[PDB]
Design a protein around this ligand. Structure first.
Ligand code: COA
Ligand code: PEA
Length: 202
């Protein structure tokens, strides 16, 4: 009996979204937790960047507070940062993109939807809000003729959200195996075993 709405995130929402992410995602996404991310303007800018694509969604409670967000942006088929902790995360994301091209799985797709930042207020977890946020994007995909939803998960819990919705894990990289320059960079808490790249054909 905790009602909420699912709404498109507007440009004026940037501040509220960042406030929520700082309380939750910035502290409790597993890589951020492992590194103890702290203040990070670069992740703020990173989070705001896809908003103008108009396919990022917020869950809002009966008090008008944001209790969940899924920030998404369009991702195109490829063709030929001072914050020292976020730099490591960014390098990991570059690395995955170097080792796995989602577009090889979908050779006839030019544009796909990329699920970038997913966060739900701890008090409201286990109610399927992340799933509701994810499904909302299907409406956008259908309107725009987008066929694939790609979500790189750094959490076993977000991977579970995607699995319930019928996403399949098309690439796994275990953190224990990520050793750029020969040494382990990340050792997040179990059950977060690795990067789980999830894809749905909607
Ligand atoms: C990942 C996250 C967005 C899921 O949101 P959610 O709305 O709770 O999603 P769900 O209700 O489907 O729960 C997913 C799974 O989380 C697990 N979970 C972790 N903590 C939980 C808790 N406090 N309450 C209930 N379930 C929890 C459960 O295994 C659950 O599976 P199940 O309910 O089907 O048995 C949320 O856990 C979160 O914000 N985590 C921290 C930030 C993060 O890791 N983001 C994703 C990085 S890719
Ligand atoms: N998709 C999750 C990856 C991630 C982890 C931490 C900061 C930004 C992005």
């Amino acid at each position: 009996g905790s009602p909420y709405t699912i709404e498109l995130i507007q440009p004026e929402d940037g501040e509220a979204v960042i406030a929520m992410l700082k309380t939750f995602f910035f502290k409790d996404e597993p890589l951020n937790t492992f590194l103890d991310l702290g203040e990070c303007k670069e992740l703020e800018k990173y989070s705001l960047k896809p908003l103008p694509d108009n396919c990022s969604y917020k869950a809002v409670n009966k008090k008008g507070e944001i209790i969940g967000v899924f920030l998404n942006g369009l991702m195109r088929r490829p063709s030929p940062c001072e914050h020292p902790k976020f730099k490591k995360i960014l390098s990991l994301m570059d690395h995955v993109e170097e080792q796995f091209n989602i577009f090889d799985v979908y050779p006839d797709e030019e544009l796909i939807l990329d699920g970038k930042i997913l966060s739900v207020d701890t008090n409201y977890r286990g109610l399927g809000i992340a799933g509701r946020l994810t499904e909302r994007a299907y409406e956008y995909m259908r309107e725009n003729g987008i066929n694939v939803y790609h979500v790189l998960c750094s959490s076993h819990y977000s991977a579970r959200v995607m699995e319930k919705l019928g996403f399949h894990e098309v690439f796994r990289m275990q953190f224990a195996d990520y050793k750029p320059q020969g040494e382990v960079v990340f050792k997040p808490a179990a059950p977060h075993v690795g990067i789980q790249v999830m894809a749905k054909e909607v």
